Structures are given as C-alpha cells and as structure tokens.
C-alpha cells in the first residue's frame, strides 16, 4: 500500500453504478471530490454509460476540458468528478436540466427538474462543530461547509443549499411527520413516512419508515434523509417509492418487449 491507492478495478467497482464486467479490468476512478465513493457515481459514468452520450473516454474528456459541462452551479472540468444524491447534473448547452436521485432499485438515475427547482440543491446536516475558531459550522454530505448555522437546526436536519447563491435559507427537522427518503442498505431509495424514531445508547438509532401503500423499511438514523415535510422539496423519480415486488418487476418488463 505504501502511499495512497491510485487506480480502481472494475470487478471491485460497485453493483449500484453497474459497469460492464467485460471491456476493461479497470474502471473510471471515483476521483476525490464532493461525494463519497460508497455514495457517489463518477461523472464519466453519468456521461458515457448513463445517457449513452459521447462515445469514448478520451472523447468525453475533450468536451469536459472545453468547458461544455456544468455540475452543481459550477462547471468543473474534472473527467471522473463525483456526482451524488441531489447533485443537479445538467448541461446548459444541451439544455438538459436534470437532478440525480436514488431509484427504488438503488441506482441514482437522472430525474428531470427545471431551473426553478435546480436553483436549490437539498442536503442534510450530519455534524455541527466549532471550526475556524469559535465560529459554529454546519457540514452537508457533499462537503458543503456552511459557516454559522441557524439556531433552529440541531442535527439530522435538512439544508436547502442554494447552488450559485450557496446559502442556507430553508430548514426542515427530522422529527416524526416529515417524509423521509431512505438512502442506505436494503430499501436504499424509496420514500415513506416516519412511524417512529427509537434510540439506544451509543448504538444505531432505528427510524421506522412505512410507504404510502404500506410495507415497512427500518433503516438506521445515518442513512435516513428528509426530502420534504410533505411531498418532494424538488421532485420524486417517477416511482414515488412504490418498490414493485419481484413478480411485479417481471410484469412490467414482459410487456416492455411487446410494445416494440
């Protein structure tokens, strides 16, 4: 190991991005940036593999360094920059205005949203700390280090980062009665409502979550994320967190070939 790991092997690469096992022992590197390796998708994956856009990785890079692409209100010409939950992946030149959210399956896919809802990127406060001297601070998962937080926000709270404005104006709590999108483990990407929140000393706090139809999901407090008090604050992927069961998935797919 000596120093730091510099390459990524595709077979090790995650099941959520889903890369073609064939076509390269190596995979694009989830290079350092705003979102974590477990919870991020490389932009070159969301350029080449996702929209089947530009052809090769070299070709993708030429457009990237021509300053043709925009991520989260800034352009960022890094080729495999991290794209995460709520990261507003949109191109003004293509006029494709989208946002990146988790599917019921667990792979974040592009959910289209316009400038009105692309102005603000939603996020959660994980840690409040006293940093840069006695200035209290607030940290979001995409490493958005806002400074002095609002008095109402404690922790597990939600921040509307304003992208180019880059300030917190809207604060939503995690207390029971706020619609919560799960982002971890098995449910990994379906909306619901908090039936209850239960804590144990120095142990994962378990938050009960049941979907609008029914069906329970009991993810731990860290993964739980408050998308809105009621309804999406920006948009919901067209699944609404239904989670169609295993036979149901076959039902949807079988007619899909028939439509052609």
């Amino acid at each position: 190991a000596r120093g730091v790991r510099k390459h990524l092997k595709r077979l090790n690469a995650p099941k959520h991005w889903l890369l073609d096992k064939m076509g390269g022992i190596w995979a694009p590197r989830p290079t350092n940036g705003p979102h974590g390796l477990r919870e991020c998708i490389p932009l070159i994956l969301i350029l080449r593999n996702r929209l089947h856009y530009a052809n090769t990785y070299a070709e993708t890079s030429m457009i990237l360094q021509d300053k043709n692409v925009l991520i989260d209100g800034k352009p960022r010409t890094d080729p495999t920059f991290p794209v995460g939950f709520m990261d507003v992946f949109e191109i003004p030149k293509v006029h494709k205005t989208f946002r990146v959210l988790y599917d019921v399956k667990g792979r974040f896919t592009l959910v289209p949203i316009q400038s009105n809802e692309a102005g603000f990127k939603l996020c959660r406060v994980q840690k409040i700390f006293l940093g840069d001297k006695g200035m209290p601070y607030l940290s979001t998962h995409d490493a958005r280090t806002i400074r002095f937080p609002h008095p109402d926000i404690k922790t597990n709270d939600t921040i509307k980062i304003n992208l180019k404005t880059g300030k917190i104006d809207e604060w939503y709590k995690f207390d029971i009665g706020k619609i919560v999108m799960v982002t971890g483990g098995r449910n990994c990407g379906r909306i619901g409502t908090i039936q209850a929140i239960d804590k144990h000393m120095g142990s994962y706090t378990m938050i009960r979550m049941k979907d609008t139809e029914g069906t329970e999901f009991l993810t731990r407090l860290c993964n739980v994320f408050v998308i809105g008090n009621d309804s999406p604050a920006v948009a919901i992927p067209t699944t609404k967190g239904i989670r169609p069961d295993i036979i149901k998935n076959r039902e949807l797919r079988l007619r899909s070939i028939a439509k052609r």
Partner: peptide, 8 residues
C-alpha cells in the same frame, strides 16, 4: 490481469 479470464 486480462478481462479474458473473467468468463464463465
């Protein structure tokens, strides 16, 4: 080494 070997 070699994507070839990962064939079932």
């Amino acid at each position: 080494p070699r994507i070839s070997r990962h064939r079932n």
